[PDB]
Design a protein around this ligand. Structure first.
Ligand SMILES: C[n+]1cn([C@@H]2O[C@H](COP(=O)(O)OP(=O)(O)OP(=O)(O)O)[C@@H](O)[C@H]2O)c2nc(N)[nH]c(=O)c21
Ligand SMILES: Nc1ncnc2c1ncn2[C@@H]1O[C@H](CSCC[C@H](N)C(=O)O)[C@@H](O)[C@H]1O
Ligand SMILES: [Mg+2]
Length: 259
């Protein structure tokens, strides 16, 4: 059993109040008041982020932890917060975005955020059985939470296998993908094998809530996985008891228009 497994147990053992206060203590949280209502009313001419994924992928780019270029695939695009961010990057030529949609899943949000004409959205798509095709940048933000860490580790393994298939088709593509439960042993093994052939490493964004152990893997960074994971588990285990609120920060406004 790992520090991550123990973190999960403590998380599930929180009362409702302990949980609500732990989830958000000390985290970065974008201020989405205007964005949410603009989405709610059906306004399409808006550059504000369609979801909280935009600021996470933006944080990765700006830090230099991902280099988004060329033909991008967004696997599991959901509302499209990553697809929109990518399409607004001048170095990006196109975005092929896929997501399952359907009952209990987010369809793409359709707006005119900068670069939108360059995204091809395909909802109703299961990326786990789709044959890969050419891409320069492979992104994947899939990983649905579950109180059951074993299920979370299996969902995570399926994401890493998916990336191995796209790397097989595109050996040179840069990848960035969520690793939902990076402490699970089948996940640590999978990520070691990925790292040994493709390079890369793990990093925590400051926007991820404490209720999730997610970390993002990218071929543009480096560092020991086991160490990356155990450092994060300890930070997470030490935040239990913190009373501080989230740090609220502005939401992205990527602007509108075609490219
Ligand atoms: C609602 N809830 C969730 N958790 C734990 O928190 C983890 C994350 O669950 P979450 O509800 O905090 O976020 P989720 O990823 O489902 O939402 P999204 O990002 O908008 O898609 C769960 O897998 C549980 O382990 C919870 N843990 C406790 N103790 N009490 C709770 O009420 C509770
Ligand atoms: N097998 C599958 N095939 C396709 N999409 C899937 C999938 N499993 C989960 N997904 C989608 O993966 C999405 C992850 S949400 C990702 C957030 C996104 N980066 C944003 O910035 O808005 C979910 O909407 C879910 O519907
Ligand atoms: Mg929930």
């Amino acid at each position: 059993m790992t520090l991550g497994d123990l973190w999960k147990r403590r998380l599930n053992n929180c009362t409702k109040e302990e949980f609500f206060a732990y989830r958000r203590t000390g985290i970065l949280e974008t201020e989405r008041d205007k964005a949410r209502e603009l989405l709610r009313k059906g306004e399409t001419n808006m550059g504000l982020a369609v979801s909280r994924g935009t600021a996470k992928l933006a944080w990765l780019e700006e830090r230099g932890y991902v280099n988004l270029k060329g033909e991008v695939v967004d696997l599991g695009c959901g509302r499209g917060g990553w697809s929109y961010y990518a399409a607004s990057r001048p170095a990006v030529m196109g975005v092929k975005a896929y997501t399952i949609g359907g009952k209990g899943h987010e369809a793409p949000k359709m707006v005119t955020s900068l670069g939108w004409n360059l995204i091809k959205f395909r909802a109703g798509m299961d990326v786990f059985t789709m044959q890969p095709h050419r891409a320069d940048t492979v992104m994947c933000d899939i990983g649905e939470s579950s109180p059951d860490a074993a299920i979370e580790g299996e969902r995570t393994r399926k994401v890493i296998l998916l990336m191995e298939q796209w790397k097989n088709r595109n050996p040179s593509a840069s990848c960035v993908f969520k690793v939902l439960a990076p402490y699970r042993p089948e996940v640590i093994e999978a990520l070691h094998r990925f790292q040994l052939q493709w390079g890369g490493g793990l990093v925590r964004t400051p926007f991820s809530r404490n209720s999730t152990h997610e970390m993002y893997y990218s071929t543009a960074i480096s560092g020991n996985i086991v160490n990356s994971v155990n450092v994060q588990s300890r930070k997470l285990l030490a935040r239990f008891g913190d009373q501080r609120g989230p740090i609220r920060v502005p939401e992205m406004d990527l602007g509108v228009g075609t490219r």
